[PDB]
């Protein structure tokens, strides 16, 4: 390991790796963690898509 | 035949039978008899049939 190590450039830098969380003080079924993605959904008994053709 | 013809009551008489009709004086394809039923048909795109559970 010398000044000759060939660096790669990245935007990711080490100053904040993996962010553990754990559930201490109840329990789990009490408190949870949603991961969801907000993606636009047309109705389903109305909107545009309907009139596809008419 | 006699006066003892049995007699079935009908409400359909025959002073006005089979009404023939017959094109003269043109093309059929210029003179066309439709037969339709005129019955409610909910639209395609909208109508409370959509909301159905909803």
């Not at 003080?25 to 408190?31: A, G, I, P, R």
């Not at 991961?35 to 636009?40: D, K, L, M």
Request: hydrophobic content about 30%.
């Amino acid at each position: 390991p010398d000044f000759t190590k060939i660096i790669w450039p990245t935007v990711v830098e080490r100053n904040f790796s993996n962010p553990q969380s754990e559930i201490t003080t109840t329990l789990q079924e009490l408190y949870g963690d949603t991961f969801e993605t907000v993606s636009i959904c047309p109705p389903q008994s109305y909107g545009g898509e309907l009139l596809k053709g008419k």
